[PDB]
Amino acid sequence: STGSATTTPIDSLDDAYITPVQIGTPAQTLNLDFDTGSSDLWVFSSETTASEVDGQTIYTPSKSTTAKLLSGATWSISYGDGSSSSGDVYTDTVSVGGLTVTGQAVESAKKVSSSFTEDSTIDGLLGLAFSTLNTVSPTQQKTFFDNAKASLDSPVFTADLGYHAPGTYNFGFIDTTAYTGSITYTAVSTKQGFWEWTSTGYAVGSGTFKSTSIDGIADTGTTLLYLPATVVSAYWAQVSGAKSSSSVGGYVFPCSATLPSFTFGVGSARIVIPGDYIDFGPISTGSSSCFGGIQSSAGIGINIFGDVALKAAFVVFNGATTPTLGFASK
C-alpha cells in the first residue's frame, strides 16, 4: 500500500505545516502537524477542557463506531518549545492520503498548553519519530508509520515541504519526479529516538565549504534551523546589522537586508537553503527588525534540522531494519 497527502503552511511564514488526517468511522478529518521529532498522535477532542479549545476541529470518539477506549492508558508530553498536552487514549481507524491503519492509538487531549489553544489551525500532532519516544503509559504505543510499515510497498515516508507553498508527505514510495539529481543517503542513530544524523559541514553564501561534523535531528515539527553557536555566528556575521538579541530571544537582522544562502552537507552532496527561507519577518507588527531562521542550538542540547532546512530538500525517512535518511535537491 501507499499514501500521499498534501501538507500546507499554517501562515505566511511557514511556522508549521498541517496535513489532513481521517480519524474514525464515519471519518472525522482533523488537520495535524506531522512531527518527525516526536512519537505521539494526539488530537483536540470532545474531552479537551472547554476553555482550552479556541477554533480547533475536535475528535469526538463517541461518534466513531470504530473507536475503543484503551483502558487505563494515559499520555503526557512536553515539547522543546515548552508547550505540552496530556490525556487518555482510544484506538481507532486512521487514514492519511489513502493509507489506512486500523487500531491506531489516538491520544485524546484533556489538557493542552496555551500555545496550542492559541493556534486555531493545528488540531493535533502526528508523530513520526521512533516509537520508543511514545509517551503512552503503561503500555507504549506505536506511531502511524510503525503500524503501517509492514503493509507499505517500501518501508519509507518522504517529506517534501514547500517554501510559502503546499508540499507533500508520501508513505510507502519515493516519487522520482519530485526531486532533481540523486538522493544521497546518510546513516541514522536511533539511540535517542530521533532521526539523528551527521551533516558533513556548511557554507555561508558563496563562501567556501567548511568540513565539520554536525550531529542533529531531522525534525519537521520544528520551524527553524538550530545549529552550533560557532556556525550561527559565522552566518549572521555576513548580514550587516544582524545581532543576537537576548530580549527577543535570538538573532535578528534589519528587514532591509538581503540574506545570504546557507549550504549544509549530506555526505559529499550539498543542500542549499536560499536566503529568503531564512527570513521570519518582523519581530512584532510594523517593526523593521526581522527574526532570523537560523538560530543557536546552545542550551537545547541538540542541533535541529527543522523546516528551514528540510523545505530546501526532498527528504526520505527510510524505516528499513537499519534506518537511514536521504536528501535530494529539488
Curated annotation (Swiss-Prot):
It comes from the Eukaryota. Residues 17-328 form the Peptidase A1 domain. Keywords: Aspartyl protease, Disulfide bond, Hydrolase, Protease, Signal, Zymogen. It is an enzyme of class 3 (hydrolase). The active site is at D35, S199. It catalyses: Hydrolysis of proteins with specificity similar to that of pepsin A, prefers hydrophobic residues at P1 and P1', but does not cleave 14-Ala-|-Leu-15 in the B chain of insulin or Z-Glu-Tyr. Clots milk. This is Endothiapepsin. The chain holds residues 90 to 419 of 419 of the full protein.
